[PDB]
Structure formats: structure tokens, C-alpha cells
């Protein structure tokens, strides 16, 4: 997370950390708890070459990454079937936990948005995670969970900005319908935040608008953070996640 602050312990109870087995249970991506038994993340986090179920663990909300870990087993990994190398997109995945989490005030699910929610500019939105604090600058020990309020940029305005200073023709789309844009030169998600939630407060309730996906660097001019638009994937999510 670029800009922003350390999250108070009481905020973002749906934030998760995805771990891969090695010399230590290394954080590779963020995720969000969307159902007591299901984690939402980015496809690039777990695909295209999916690791064994034995090689992965889910860590629920923790204030300090690697301090007081309590790792949870996974029973299933589902990468969106349209995710593939040669196209940035369909960047969404699900992990089914072996057991539903016993939800508390400090650890619970995020509400998924209704299909009609477009999350227009002006909306109060926040992105959280344990990623880099700048380009090639690590979040330092004790690895506190960070948060940052990011402005939403309309898709067509965002796509035009990504065409500035590139070889890519105005003919072909860079920012697609299954994507959402947020962030500026002071506030953005960064490497290590991928898979994590972008949440907006709508009519008193926090809705997950996006999944940290990609960008060109972090907090760079004419390069806002790109997220997978959750509404676009609701029907796919609901083929696995009980409503």
C-alpha cells in the first residue's frame, strides 16, 4: 500500500493473507473472506500453474504479518477458466476452506455488491494489504496491515490514460468491462497487495468493489491501479459460493 496508514485492529475483518510452503509460510497474495468457507483472490495469485492443496494455507486477519500466525487448510482452488497468459484479464479465483470460519466482530466476511452497483467516481473506497510502500520499497518488519483511501476513476477515462505514452492503438482496449480503476500518484495498492480487497461504503455497508490485480508500477502518473470488477464475476462466484 502506497500512502495511507497502519490499519486500526478493528478495521477490515475480511482481509486475508495467502501463504505458500517453503523455508517459511510465505505471503504471496492478499485475499478476502466472502463467505465463512470461501476466500476471494486474483487468478494470477494461484494460476496458471496451481500448487498442491498441501502447499497452501490461509491466514485470516492479522495486525502484523508473520506475528501470531494460525494457518488454515484449503480443500479446493478454483481459477477463473478464462484466465490465461497472453491477456490481462479474468483475474479472479476462489479458495474453499476445509471448515467455515467461526465469525466474530474482529474476523468476518465482506458483503459482495449487487449486480447494479457501478461504484462511480466520488465513492469512498479503501484498499488494504501488506504490500510494498512504494516502487521497489518493502513494507518493513513488523509488517503492519496498511490501508489507503483511493479515488475511483471512470473506466473509459482510465483506459484513455493508459493509452498515454504507449505504442498501443486507441483501437484496442487496455481497461476492460471486467476491470475497475482506482488510485492516484499519492495513493495506490502495490506488489504484495494483489488478490486483496478494494472496498467501498455504500448506504452504511462496506461492499467489495474490486480485487487488487495489476497496474504499471505503483502510484505512477496516468497509471491508476487496476482491479478486477467484482460485479462482473458475481454469476461465476455464485456457481461455487452459497448466496
Amino acid at each position: 500500500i502506497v500512502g495511507g496508514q497502519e490499519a486500526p485492529r478493528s478495521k477490515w475483518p475480511w482481509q486475508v493473507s495467502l501463504r505458500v510452503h517453503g523455508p517459511y509460510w510465505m505471503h504471496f497474495c492478499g485475499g478476502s473472506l466472502i463467505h465463512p468457507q470461501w476466500v476471494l483472490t486474483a487468478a494470477h495469485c494461484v494460476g496458471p500453474d496451481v500448487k498442491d492443496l498441501a502447499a497452501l494455507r490461509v491466514q485470516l486477519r492479522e495486525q502484523h504479518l508473520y506475528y501470531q500466525d494460525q494457518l488454515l487448510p484449503v480443500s479446493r482452488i478454483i481459477v477463473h477458466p478464462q484466465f490465461y497468459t497472453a491477456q490481462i484479464g479474468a483475474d479472479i479465483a476462489l479458495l474453499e476452506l476445509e471448515e467455515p470460519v467461526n465469525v466474530s466482530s474482529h474476523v468476518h466476511t465482506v458483503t459482495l455488491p449487487p449486480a447494479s452497483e457501478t461504484f462511480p467516481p466520488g465513492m469512498p473506497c479503501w484498499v488494504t494489504g501488506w504490500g510494498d510502500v512504494d516502487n521497489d520499497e518493502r513494507l518493513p518488519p513488523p509488517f503492519p496491515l496498511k490501508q489507503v483511501k483511493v479515488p475511483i476513476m471512470e473506466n473509459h477515462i482510465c483506459d484513455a490514460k493508459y493509452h498515454l505514452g504507449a505504442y498501443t492503438g486507441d483501437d484496442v482496449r487496455i481497461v476492460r468491462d471486467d476491470m475497475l480503476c482506482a488510485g492516484n500518484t499519492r495513493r495506490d495498492s502495490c506488489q504484495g497487495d494483489s488478490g486483496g480487497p478494494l472496498v467501498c461504503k455504500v448506504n452504511g455497508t462496506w461492499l467489495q468493489a474490486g480485487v487488487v490485480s495489476w497496474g504499471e508500477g505503483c502510484a505512477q502518473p496516468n497509471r491508476p491501479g487496476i482491479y478486477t470488477r467484482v460485479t462482473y464475476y458475481l454469476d461465476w462466484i455464485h456457481h461455487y459460493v452459497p448466496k
Partner: antibody, heavy 119, light 107 residues
Framework: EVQLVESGGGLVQPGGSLRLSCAAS????????MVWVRQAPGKGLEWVAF????????YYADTMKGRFTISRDNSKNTLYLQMNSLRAEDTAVYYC????????????WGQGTLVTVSS | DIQMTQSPSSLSASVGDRVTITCSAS?????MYWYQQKPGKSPKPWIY???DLASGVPSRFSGSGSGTDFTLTISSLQPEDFATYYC?????????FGQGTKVEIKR
């Protein structure tokens, strides 16, 4: 001593039903994933089923799905295998085995219980 | 889903011989697990996470491989190694075992 003891095997007619049970001792049973593995006489190990610590997750081999049901009773430290519509090809020793908590290999196995499906 | 093909189905080797058992997964997997089972006995964990030896397993045993190809090696075959060895993946459900390799000792 960490132990698993299977029971309930025996001779059953084709189309019959049988419930196998596996008594666990020496560990906190409710913390572990548990599985059934069978071995036909003179043949290899064949995975049957898996059940998570809290019973929310169950999986089966393709040829036994539907007909076999895995369950557990954590207050009784017991794992069960409900076998219905039994066929000659189900004849095997059925092993109860514990999934290692940290590394997921099957680290404790019972002595096994022989099931013979014949008329 | 993941299918295991183990080879050879049986072998006869001399004490002190280097013995290699192979296991092929139908699709790429992170780890390989191995079990030893003696006649009329129940299986025992032998190797896990491709190369980690279970407790009490002697260091003449080793495991290696990646992707779809894995092996179990005995650097110096011993009389007590007489057994059937099985490979097993833990990639996703359904789980499967390889067909086994029966090891006999020459004399």
C-alpha cells in the same frame, strides 16, 4: 500411544450394506483430517475418502462416490465408513489413516478390516 | 484428475545396489509422497514433500523430482528394504496412489 483400530469388516452379500468404524486414541482426533484407503487381496492401495476435522469437507474416489459415506463422531473419537450397494470389486482390507497435521502425509494407519463381498 | 503411473511393477536387486523407483503424475504437481508396506502389514509413511524422510527412515532412502516426474532412490539396498513401495500425490481431490513397486532381494 497414537493408535487407529478398524472394526466392522466381514462377509456381506452383493447388494448389501456395511458400516465400518475406526476407533482413534492417543491424539486430539477433532484436530485431524482422516481418510479411508482400501487394498484388494494381492493388489495396491486405493484411496477411498477424506473427511476434514470438523466434517464440513468430504471427498470420495470416483468409483465409490454416492454408495460410500464417510463420517466421524468427534465426541467418540471414531471415524465411520458407510458402504451400500456392495459389489464383488469392493472386497478389500479397509484401512483408516490420519493426515499429518503439518505435512499432510498419512502418518498413522490402523491394522485394517477385511470386507468380503460374496454370495 | 491427477493419475499416478508407477514403474517398474517389480524388481529384484542385490544388497548394496542402487535402486530407483519412478512415479509419473498425469499433470504437474508440487510434491510426491511415498509409503512402504511389508507383506501382511499396514503401510508406513516413508517420504513426504518429495524429499523429506519420515521419522526412523534410514538416509539410504531419498526422494527427488518435480512437475510430472519423481523418484524414490535406495543408495545401498538392504535386506530389511524387502517391501512394496507406493507413490501418492496430494495435489487436489481425488487423491490417487501409484500401482506399487515390489522389491525382492537377490542372494
Amino acid at each position: 500411544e497414537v493408535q487407529l483400530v478398524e472394526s466392522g469388516g466381514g462377509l456381506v452379500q452383493p447388494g448389501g450394506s456395511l458400516r465400518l468404524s475406526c476407533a482413534a486414541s492417543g491424539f486430539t482426533f477433532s484436530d485431524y483430517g482422516m481418510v479411508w484407503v482400501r487394498q484388494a487381496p494381492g493388489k495396491g492401495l486405493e484411496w477411498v475418502a477424506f473427511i476434514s476435522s470438523g466434517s464440513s469437507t468430504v471427498y470420495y474416489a470416483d468409483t465409490m462416490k454416492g454408495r460410500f459415506t464417510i463420517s466421524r463422531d468427534n465426541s467418540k473419537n471414531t471415524l465411520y465408513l458407510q458402504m451400500n450397494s456392495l459389489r464383488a470389486e469392493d472386497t478389500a482390507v479397509y484401512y483408516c489413516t490420519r493426515r499429518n497435521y503439518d505435512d499432510w502425509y498419512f502418518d498413522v494407519w490402523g491394522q485394517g478390516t477385511l470386507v468380503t463381498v460374496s454370495s | 484428475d491427477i493419475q499416478m503411473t508407477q514403474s517398474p511393477s517389480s524388481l529384484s536387486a542385490s544388497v548394496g545396489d542402487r535402486v530407483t523407483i519412478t512415479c509419473s503424475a498425469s499433470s504437474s504437481v508440487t510434491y510426491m509422497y511415498w509409503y512402504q508396506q511389508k507383506p501382511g502389514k499396514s503401510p508406513k509413511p516413508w517420504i513426504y514433500r518429495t524429499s523429506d524422510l519420515a521419522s526412523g527412515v534410514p538416509s539410504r532412502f531419498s526422494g527427488s523430482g518435480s512437475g510430472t516426474d519423481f523418484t524414490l532412490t535406495i543408495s545401498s539396498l538392504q535386506p530389511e528394504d524387502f517391501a512394496t513401495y507406493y507413490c501418492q500425490h496430494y495435489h487436489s481431490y481425488p487423491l490417487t496412489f501409484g500401482q506399487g513397486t515390489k522389491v525382492e532381494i537377490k542372494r
